[PDB]
């Protein structure tokens, strides 16, 4: 699935 990836990408900040 892409749900975990979707969440990680929405939460990521550098």
């Amino acid at each position, epitope marked *: 699935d892409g*749900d*975990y*990836e979707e*969440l*990680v990408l929405a*939460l*990521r*900040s*550098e």
Partner: antibody
Amino acid sequence: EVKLEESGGGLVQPGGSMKLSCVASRFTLSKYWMNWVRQSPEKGLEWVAQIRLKSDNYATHYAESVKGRFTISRDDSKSSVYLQMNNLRAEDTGIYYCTGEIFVNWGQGTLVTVSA
Amino acid sequence: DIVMTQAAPSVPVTPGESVSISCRSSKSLLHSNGNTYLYWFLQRPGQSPQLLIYRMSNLASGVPDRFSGSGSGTAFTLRISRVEAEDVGVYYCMQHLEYPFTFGAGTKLELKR
């Protein structure tokens, strides 16, 4: 379901070396930052190290108590993250977990005992 | 560094009643983003920690809706509306605003009888 699995722990001499491994299944490791977190009854949960992606030039960050002795690395093609621990101290004893970027996924942990 | 304080080392509850678990940070966990960089975990005995809440108030996927998280910059609260036996273990807060990421000492939930 995603699964993280740590290995390489055990009993080790103070001043000695030990390399831990973490292998990911059903998880595209290459897309995510990885972390090592350890646990002891003395210090509780302690964040140890983090490794970012290839496009982040594999940027690393470490806890101060571990800086200069521990090295975190990844090998995306082996679906793995590692923790090379050198000049080990009694304080380094405990359960070592690897986790993914958002702390949803944790392995079962590997026990590291530093003693003479 | 960013110090996470959980004043209660333990908290007792009668099954089916509610509980609040407090955490505090030595600096605001609010990012210019508008998000609060705080996680809540449950560590059931003999198990690995499990995520309950991300960004101070969001339920992680598959966590029961009896859990909630709230707070204001430096003071945070995890709440369970009705405690069940599967809720016993150690509750930890964690900040990820700055390096090093830091955890509170933990609050263990105990059932009254």
